[PDB]
Design an enzyme around this catalytic site. Structure first.
Site, PDB file in Angstrom:
ATOM      1  N   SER A 217       0.783  -1.212   0.000  1.00  0.00           N
ATOM      2  CA  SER A 217       0.000   0.000   0.000  1.00  0.00           C
ATOM      3  C   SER A 217       0.835   1.292   0.000  1.00  0.00           C
ATOM      4  O   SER A 217       0.422   2.342  -0.516  1.00  0.00           O
ATOM      5  CB  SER A 217      -0.912  -0.023   1.206  1.00  0.00           C
ATOM      6  OG  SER A 217      -1.556   1.239   1.351  1.00  0.00           O
TER       7      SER A 217
ATOM      8  N   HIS B 211      -1.542  -9.692  -1.390  1.00  0.00           N
ATOM      9  CA  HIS B 211      -1.980  -8.793  -2.466  1.00  0.00           C
ATOM     10  C   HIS B 211      -1.607  -9.549  -3.733  1.00  0.00           C
ATOM     11  O   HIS B 211      -0.842 -10.508  -3.674  1.00  0.00           O
ATOM     12  CB  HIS B 211      -1.176  -7.494  -2.522  1.00  0.00           C
ATOM     13  CG  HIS B 211      -1.380  -6.591  -1.359  1.00  0.00           C
ATOM     14  ND1 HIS B 211      -0.681  -5.422  -1.167  1.00  0.00           N
ATOM     15  CD2 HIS B 211      -2.213  -6.697  -0.293  1.00  0.00           C
ATOM     16  CE1 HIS B 211      -1.092  -4.867  -0.016  1.00  0.00           C
ATOM     17  NE2 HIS B 211      -2.026  -5.602   0.559  1.00  0.00           N
TER      18      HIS B 211
HETATM   19 ZN   LIG Z   1      -3.231  -1.513  -0.281  1.00  0.00          ZN
HETATM   20 ZN   LIG Z   2      -5.212   1.665   2.526  1.00  0.00          ZN
HETATM   21 ZN   LIG Z   3      -3.079  -4.960   1.954  1.00  0.00          ZN
END
Ligand SMILES: [Zn+2]
Ligand SMILES: [Zn+2]
Ligand SMILES: [Zn+2]
Ligand SMILES: [Zn+2]
Ligand SMILES: [Zn+2]
Ligand SMILES: [Zn+2]
Lengths: 446, 446
Positions: A99, A409
């Site tokens: 992120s 992710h």
């Molecule tokens: Zn993220």
């Molecule tokens: Zn976030």
């Molecule tokens: Zn994440």
């Protein structure tokens, strides 16, 4: 410029032409969606981890397969962008981003390593789109459902070598060079206080309890510092609604939770063979989501109200954060609920942008995630759960990319959609860093 | 109408603005890409199982993260479409479709149950876009790298209650009501013969060995019947290149394999913890792909050459089939190579369309698949493999949606891209059945 008023199956999905979403030719409508005029304002909506799979699963459950999200699906110009990061040591691509590296890319236009915030692989600071917007005289907002120290909202106001440097104590340990008592710019929270955006709303009140290790406000808690610098602090929907003005003289800091704000829906975690060994799930509203806690749509609306008073224009970034977090947790109901929640926020933003006429709205995600929609009889090695959808049928969701506690992710390119001046720049294949340049340009920033 | 000549990272990806794909504002170019004029021809390219995840993984490997597929990524109008099927009994959505129900959706404009070809949930036949093109006097082509009996190409020319009804013997058993000897229209192969498209190329010569159980050609093998009806049969590149004409009077049938045509690249199968326990892989070309076996790009080119002689226009469907199959097999190299293969095919199509000027090219997939791109150090419950990409870095691919031998399809919405007259109709959110209506109208079919 028209927003897609309705793209749900037009009729009987079992009948010829009944599952169609279009009712005619779109050429003319697309021609009316193209404009290179300058954008006075820009509203960026980020669904953390909201990849195409996450949008599909939410729609299916909450609206039905033939349904339509009034906010998320309504943007006419759509594309697909890439978000790979870089290896710090080699400078080679790192296909799956976190992120922090991804938020840095759209906020500064430069790729970086996983865990970095506002710096490149050489750890050099780079001005963010927010800092630039503010320097130009534009109003600025940063709204999120996560802690304000989380990567996504922090990237707009901080520059640290590690995303873990939330406040003073972690910075001293993890980001010595950023540590205030070592001559650095400070921790994420300290830099946030310095960035002084006009409107900042989210959770993470906890870290604001730490006390500065040095400087003018040494010994005071970051909360005290905030007040001393003139920030008007609000901690609930009532006090938030009370706010009539927000600017540089009297900036707004909303802290609505010690950590992340409460999720909208509740449901059990996906389990091994859960679609087979257990009954179908029907999500339930969280009794703790609260009437005192503003929703993402409420926060977005107040922010727009307050920022729209600035005649030069504004930049607002809104984050539906728990999508990603519930996806990590393998909790379909939490994930889907946060997607529904983001949709409401997108709706408010589109309503304003449609009237105002000079606002660029962009809805996208930082990176893809684990959840996959699979057949009901699937016998998978990971965690799965069957859900009762609005269609009155079962949908099975699978999380199978990790044996650890958190699902990973994924690096697939994903949807980016827009509406307004310069929206054309999100069509086709683009890169996340392109988003920084598109916004800078649409805003006329120099 | 311009194609995106180059969308690769413009420079040093570690430097500010170096990972950008755009070099300026796209508004004007998008304006020049919109046209409601009638399409004289339509080239539909299908990557079976080619979801966004598959395009990204293939790009990273073959072109590098900041790379650009000259064909696949060059189409300017992009969108995302849904492809859910229907439960036969209930009529309720079936979130994950198979290859038969999805192909039926874009070829007839009506949703159906998994396994069905050319019929709705009530088992009613519906005319396909190919049958309609032909009736209007347009040339028609059906090309694939799979057996011609495979769902994707079959859906254009057959109507049976089950995709398993390849030829006579299976139809009698699986599709009694379609069984020729029981008064039905016949097996997939027999109906194909009846449909009489101008150009048909693919594998599946094996089933043509079966002999008809009834009718005018009872006792003759389907290959005999084909010659007897006037089809010119070619079995290799040499003979394929010899073909100067292809029409209703002298239709072409190319069978280049007993079953599915050979895959381009070879690699080991993904294994449990393969990214950890094993070295990185580098794909190797298949020594058996052969100089006598035309590639997808060659087949597309010949088809275009032959079909372009028809003045009314043409409809051609090209299928890069083994992407889906290698994905089911959890073989990254096979899946990626077939995606590269498809890209070459897309290029040929775009080159012609750009010159010709009245050709609508559409590149999409029938449904999403298993493969996910994950972090290198991922410890996943399924099958994974680490590959050495063109970037000189490692990419790990994961398959984790099934404990059986085949990895499952997934229901996430996925990319659809177009170029030419009426391309606007693929932008934003649409449905797979909308694809049928878009092609029918762009062609002026009535
Ligand atoms: Zn993220
Ligand atoms: Zn976030
Ligand atoms: Zn994440
Ligand atoms: Zn398929
Ligand atoms: Zn296929
Ligand atoms: Zn398949």
């Amino acid at each position: 410029m028209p927003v897609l008023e309705n793209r749900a199956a037009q009729g009987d999905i079992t009948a010829p032409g009944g599952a169609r979403r279009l009712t005619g030719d779109q050429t003319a409508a697309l021609r009316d969606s193209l404009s290179d005029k300058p954008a006075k304002n820009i509203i960026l909506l980020i669904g953390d981890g909201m990849g195409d799979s996450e949008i599909t699963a939410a729609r299916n459950y909450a609206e039905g397969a033939g349904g339509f999200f009034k906010g998320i699906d309504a943007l006419p110009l759509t594309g697909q962008y890439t978000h790979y990061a870089l290896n710090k040591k080699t400078g080679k691509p790192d296909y799956v981003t976190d992120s922090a590296a991804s938020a840095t890319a759209w906020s500064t236009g430069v790729k970086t390593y996983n865990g970095a915030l506002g710096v490149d692989i050489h750890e050099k600071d780079h001005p963010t789109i927010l800092e630039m917007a503010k320097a130009a005289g534009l109003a600025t907002g940063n709204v999120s459902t996560a802690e304000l120290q989380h990567a996504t909202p922090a990237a707009l106001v901080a520059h640290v070598t590690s995303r873990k440097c939330y406040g003073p104590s972690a910075t001293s340990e993890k980001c010595p060079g950023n540590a205030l008592e070592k001559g650095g710019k400070g921790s994420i929270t300290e830099q946030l206080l310095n960035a002084r955006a006009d409107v900042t709303l989210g959770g993470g009140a906890k870290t604001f309890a730490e006390t500065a290790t040095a400087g003018e406000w040494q010994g005071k808690t970051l909360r005290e510092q905030a007040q001393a610098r003139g920030y008007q602090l609000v901690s609930d929907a009532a006090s938030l609604n009370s706010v009539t003005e927000a600017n540089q003289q009297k900036p707004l800091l909303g802290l609505f939770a010690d950590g992340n704000m409460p999720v909208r829906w509740l449901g059990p975690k996906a389990t091994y063979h859960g679609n087979i060994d257990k009954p179908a799930v029907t999500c339930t509203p969280n009794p703790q989501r609260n009437d005192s806690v503003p929703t993402l749509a409420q926060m977005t609306d107040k922010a727009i109200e307050l920022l729209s008073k600035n005649e030069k224009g504004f930049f607002l970034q809104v984050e539906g954060a728990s999508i990603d977090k519930q996806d990590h947790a393998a909790n379909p109901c939490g994930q889907i609920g946060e997607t529904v929640d983001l949709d409401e926020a997108v709706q408010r933003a589109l309503e304003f942008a449609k009237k105002e006429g000079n606002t660029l709205v962009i809805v996208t995600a930082d990176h893809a995630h684990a959840s996959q929609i699979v057949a009901p009889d699937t016998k998978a090695p990971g965690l799965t759960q069957a859900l009762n959808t609005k269609d009155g049928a079962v949908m099975v969701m699978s999380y199978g990319n990790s044996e650890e506690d958190s699902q990973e992710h994924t690096g697939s390119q994903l949807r980016i959609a827009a509406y307004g001046p310069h929206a054309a720049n999100v069509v086709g294949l683009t890169d996340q860093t392109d988003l920084f340049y598109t916004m800078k340009a649409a805003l006329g920033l120099k």
